């Protein structure tokens, strides 16, 4: 059993070890961001990539290093080298780029950032599983903000209830 990289979503210099399951938006909400208060001039850092995983919705995106991706034997590693080459070409462009042009690039990154956050929001629930957990939660088939119905996903009911109870109540309405 192996995970597959679908898309590289972002890159950062982050606190060493601020990667994997503790960096999901829902781990962060429950326990705090592992990268909280990281100032790259006051502590050791490492290059981390935000990964959208094949077959997992955007709420499950995690930060990873080249090291953790290789240790976990993830598929889609050709995408890493591509992303690095793309990012190297952008840095180069920025280094010899107008203030105006650099200005428009930075607005585009903010809008993209905003769009990516929408993908982690359940817009509505459209099915539920017959089977419940021992704690009585079904799983829910979720339609995500800003994504087509093809990108709906089954999600753990206990998890979805923490933040999207109103969607649950609308669905059973």
């Amino acid at each position: 059993e192996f995970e597959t990289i679908e898309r590289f979503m972002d890159c950062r210099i982050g606190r060493k070890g601020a990667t994997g399951a503790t960096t999901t938006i829902y781990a962060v909400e429950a326990d705090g961001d592992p990268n909280a208060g990281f100032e790259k001039n006051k502590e050791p850092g490492e290059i981390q990539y935000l990964i959208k995983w094949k077959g997992w919705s955007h709420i499950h995106n995690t930060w990873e290093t080249e090291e953790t991706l290789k240790q976990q034997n993830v598929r889609g590693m050709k995408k890493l080298d591509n992303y690095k080459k793309k990012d190297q070409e952008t840095k180069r462009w920025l280094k010899n780029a107008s203030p105006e042009d650099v200005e428009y690039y930075n607005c585009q990154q903010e809008l993209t950032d905003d769009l990516h956050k929408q993908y982690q929001i359940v817009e509505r629930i459209i099915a539920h599983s017959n089977q419940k957990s021992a704690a009585g939660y079904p799983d829910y088939y979720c339609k995500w903000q800003g994504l087509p119905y093809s990108e709906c996903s089954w999600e753990d009911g206990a998890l979805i209830s923490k933040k999207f109870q109103a969607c649950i109540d609308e669905y059973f309405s």
């Binding site: 399951a21 999901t24 829902y26 997992w56 995690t62 599983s129 089977q131 089954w154 753990d156």
Partner: peptide
């Protein structure tokens, strides 16, 4: 069961 979470 298609639903999972990151552990």
């Amino acid at each position: 069961r298609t639903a999972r979470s990151k552990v």
